[PDB]
Amino acid sequence: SALPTPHEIRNHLDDYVIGQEQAKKVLAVAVYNHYKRLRNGDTSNGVELGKSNILLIGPTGSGKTLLAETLARLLDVPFTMADATTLTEAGYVGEDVENIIQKLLQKSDYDVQKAQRGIVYIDQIDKISRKSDNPSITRDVSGEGVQQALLKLIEGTVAAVPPQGGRQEFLQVDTSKILFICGGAFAGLDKVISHRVETGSGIGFGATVKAKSDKASEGELLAQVEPEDLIKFGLIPEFIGRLPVVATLNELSEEALIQILKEPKNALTKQYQALFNLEGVDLEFRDEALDAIAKKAMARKTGARGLRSIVEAALLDTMYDLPSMEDVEKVVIDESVIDGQSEPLLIY
């Protein structure tokens, strides 16, 4: 009945995530502390055990969704994944907040005692930010109105969930023990933080001019974030209080992309290597081709998500004639193959 440690869970994620050290510590410590809180259940000397949610921040295609999915594999309690862009303020045409709890029970097979001990994740949280700039009569619903509904959910209270797909029977489900991991790529947040921190100068002659912001520093700038910086973005102070912990994820570097195709077991290189291993054929991928693929990805400003297009576009012809081909034991791909000038060398 031994629970996993923060070091053990961190090593498990290293085999599926690359280039994110500070964020791994938060999820490991939070998930570790989560098991302890639910396990004790105000039975030990420690009475009224609190809760601490997590707020992930990082650019697009940085790996936020990856940590949420890979973590659920080793996680014992259930896990779900939703989006807040479709939520509405209790009555509009779009959606209801309790739909999140409905998807949670599907993973737990309608086990209330087991669902309360589960974990929940939210994606695209930046879309919830104030839209109208200190709103007017329009009564923003997609924005501010959504945060107010979540306030009680994140803190803890009973709710109502349809049993088998309704919209006259509702079951109560507490949420004080349920954890939430909100995350969404924020747009323009770097500008807001930079403008606030690095400026103490007027435009006139007498005012002194502070020399700062020499480099962009996207990774090091988000580290200096604070709740007041988010208020200018559009978030409410009450909502930020429900999410005390913060995590800053750095963008992807060129060399980082090479590691993603070699270190993790789910790398596409290992997938295609195993795709031909069943056929009794070997595969190879030289460094001359991997570094070039990273340049094509950054050139297209698509990131690691749009990386399969570069691989499948090259091996399209080879995969077509490979099944019919016989007496072929190994295939070698070169940098020229990625450009398309040459064809991958085949070993008979």
Ligand X SMILES: Nc1ncnc2c1ncn2[C@@H]1O[C@H](COP(=O)(O)OP(=O)(O)OP(O)(O)=S)[C@@H](O)[C@H]1O
Footprint of ligand X on this chain (CB under 6 A)? Answer: 17-20, 58, 60-66, 123, 185, 238, 260, 304-305
Cβ atoms 144, 154 nearer than 8 A: no
User: Which one of a copy of itself, ligand ADP, ligand X, none interacts with residue 48, CB within 5 to 8 A by kind?
Assistant: a copy of itself
**Cβ closer to ligand X: 28 or 281?**
28
The piece of 60-68, 85-93, 193-201, 309-317 that touches ligand ADP (CB under 6 A) is 60-68
Which residues, numbered 271-300, are part of the site for a copy of itself (CB under 8 A)?
A: 271, 273-275, 277-279, 300
The piece of 15-23, 45-53, 160-168, 275-283 that touches ligand ADP (CB under 6 A) is 15-23
Q: Cβ-count burial of 24 within 10 angstroms (0-12 exposed, 13-18 middle, 19+ buried)?
A: buried
Per-residue DSSP letter, 306: G
Q: Is 289 in the site for ligand ADP (CB under 6 A)?
A: no
Q: Is 238 in the site for a copy of itself (CB under 8 A)?
A: yes
**Cβ closer to ligand ADP: 17 or 146?**
17
Rounded CA separation 248/217 (Å): 12
Among 217, 253, 309, 342, which residue sits at the site for a copy of itself (rule: CB under 8 A)?
309
Among 14, 95, 198, 251, which residue sits at the site for a copy of itself (rule: CB under 8 A)?
95
**Cβ closer to ligand X: 18 or 230?**
18
Cβ atoms 178, 118 nearer than 8 A: yes
Q: Is 18 in the site for ligand ADP (CB under 6 A)?
A: yes
Q: Is 341 in the site for a copy of itself (CB under 8 A)?
A: no
Q: Is 188 in the site for a copy of itself (CB under 8 A)?
A: no
The residues near 98 (Cβ < 8 Å, ≥ 6 apart) are 159, 160, 161
Rounded CA separation 323/346 (Å): 13
**Cβ closer to ligand X: 192 or 258?**
258
**Cβ closer to ligand ADP: 17 or 27?**
17
Which helix (H) or strand (E) covers residue 155, if one does? helix 144-155
Q: Which residues does residue 79 pair with via DSSP β-bridges, in sequence order?
A: 119
Q: Is 342 in the site for a copy of itself (CB under 8 A)?
A: no
Among 6, 12, 75, 258, which residue sits at the site for a copy of itself (rule: CB under 8 A)?
6
207 three-state secondary structure? coil
What is the β-pairing status of strands 82-83 and 119-123? parallel
The residues near 56 (Cβ < 8 Å, ≥ 6 apart) are 23, 64, 67, 181, 182, 183, 247, 249
Rounded CA separation 332/282 (Å): 9
Among 124, 194, 224, 259, which residue sits at the site for a copy of itself (rule: CB under 8 A)?
124
Kindly state the tokens that stand for 104: 């949670």
User: Which one of ligand X, ligand ADP, a copy of itself, none interacts with residue 214, CB within 5 to 8 A by kind?
Assistant: none
Rounded CA separation 319/324 (Å): 10
**Cβ closer to ligand X: 104 or 260?**
260
* Residue linked to tokens 């019919």: 324
The DSSP secondary structure of 58-92, one letter per residue, reads --TTSSHHHHHHHHHHH-SS-B--EESTT--SSSS
Q: Is 3 in the site for a copy of itself (CB under 8 A)?
A: no
Residues in the chain: 348
Q: Is 305 in the site for ligand ADP (CB under 6 A)?
A: yes
Q: Shortest distance, CB of residue 257 to ligand ADP, whole angstroms?
A: 9
* Residue linked to tokens 């291993």: 277
The piece of 34-42, 55-63, 154-162, 277-285 that touches ligand ADP (CB under 6 A) is 55-63
Kindly state the tokens that stand for 189: 């947040």
Residues that bind ligand ADP (CB under 6 A): 17-19, 60-66, 123, 252, 260, 264, 304-305
